Write a protein that binds this ligand. Structure first.
Ligand SMILES: CCOC(=O)CNCc1ccc(-c2cn[nH]c2-c2c[nH]c(C(=O)N[C@H](CO)c3ccc(F)c(Cl)c3)c2)cc1Cl
Length: 347
């Protein structure tokens, strides 16, 4: 059994010639040569059975990506694990191998307007399919956007993905959230659980703004600082947008702040295309109900060179979890992970 950087990586005999890529919070990704299809692939070793959270993230992703099939979404083409639940200590998920990601690119490369336009198109084409399945990604950021040498984009990491639930989206002021801070919609800190499609559009808006300047538009250093960064550019919410926030603690917090004017997009981004900034404005709308939807975003004049709704596929049916995974112990989640991966075993 071959191992990478002092960690067991038993994926043989089908996958050999391992090379390190990255290491997550509860796993490791390596590139490996597939002896059946004779092509290099990415294998993600997962060790989640000691924590309920990691088991929940593993299962959600496996169930969603096995039912999804789209050019701009990472796939699960094979799953390797032990033949019994007793012997299963790890799970190896075989996915698409991509040379780089948008986080890596933005650190050192200046993106031409053509590149920004093409990247945004593929993100939204991928998101159209995700949202048509009534699924929310909930953690869109440059590191979860993989790219190959020809700039083909794939959305990855569905660990925080959920079925859309707009009727149960309301919550109190300063409710704790898991998803990456810099890409959190303003309503998360005010009165939202992130159970609507509009939280993903906000994250895409932040990604677009980041592609234009090679720096995160709202780099909050802590929970409430995130909202203050958003209000610093958007300005004070209108009376209309304030009236939509019925929660008194959230509304009175916004009312306590001095009046702040809107920073114009052309001042923040002097070299950006005017159509790119008009679409940015619509994605970074304070009110989630007035925020542009994925299909509307794809039809925006900025993406006219690529827009073709007949070549922007949707899922065949809406997604539905058989049971709620929020209140299941790590032991039961192990069984569910064992069951969902059974179809990939040699027998
Ligand atoms: C700071 C630690 O960094 C990360 O977690 C991600 N960046 C490194 C990286 C960069 C590229 C790739 C890569 C290259 N080709 N295919 C993939 C890939 C294949 N699957 C995934 C994936 O599911 N990634 C998510 C995070 O985006 C993830 C989720 C949970 C995890 F335990 C790990 Cl290790 C990774 C990525 C893999 C990796 Cl791990």
């Amino acid at each position: 059994p071959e191992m990478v950087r002092g960690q067991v990586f038993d994926v043989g005999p089908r996958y050999t010639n391992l090379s390190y890529i990255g290491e997550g919070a509860y796993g490791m990704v390596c590139s490996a040569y597939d002896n059946v299809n004779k092509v290099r692939v990415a294998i993600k070793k997962i060790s989640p059975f000691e924590h309920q959270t990691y088991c929940q993230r593993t299962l959600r992703e496996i169930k969603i990506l096995l039912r999804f099939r789209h050019e701009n979404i990472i796939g699960i083409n094979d799953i390797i694990r032990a033949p019994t639940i007793e012997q299963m200590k790890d799970v190896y998920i075989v996915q698409d191998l991509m040379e780089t990601d948008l986080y890596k690119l933005l650190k050192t490369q200046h993106l031409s307007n053509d590149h920004i336009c093409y990247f945004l198109y593929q993100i939204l084409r991928g998101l159209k399919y995700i949202h048509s399945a009534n699924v929310l990604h909930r953690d869109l950021k440059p590191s979860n956007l993989l790219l190959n040498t020809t700039c083909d984009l794939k959305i990855c990491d569905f660990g925080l993905a959920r079925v859309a639930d707009p009727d149960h989206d309301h919550t109190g002021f300063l409710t704790e959230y898991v998803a990456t801070r810099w890409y959190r919609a303003p309503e998360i800190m005010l009165n939202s659980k992130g159970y609507t499609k509009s939280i993903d559009i906000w994250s895409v808006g932040c990604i677009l703004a980041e592609m234009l300047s090679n720096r995160p538009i709202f780099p909050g250093k802590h929970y409430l600082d995130q909202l203050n960064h958003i209000l610093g550019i958007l300005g004070s919410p209108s009376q209309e947008d304030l009236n939509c926030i019925i929660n008194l603690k959230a509304r009175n917090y916004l009312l306590s702040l001095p009046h702040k004017n809107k920073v114009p997009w052309n001042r923040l981004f002097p070299n950006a295309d005017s159509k790119a900034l008009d679409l940015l404005d619509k994605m970074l709308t304070f009110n989630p109900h007035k925020r542009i939807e994925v299909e509307q975003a794809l039809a925006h004049p900025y993406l006219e060179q690529y827009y073709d709704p007949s070549d922007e596929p949707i899922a065949e049916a809406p997604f539905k979890f058989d049971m709620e995974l929020d209140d299941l112990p790590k032991e039961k989640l192990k069984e569910l992970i064992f069951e969902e991966t059974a179809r990939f075993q040699p027998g």
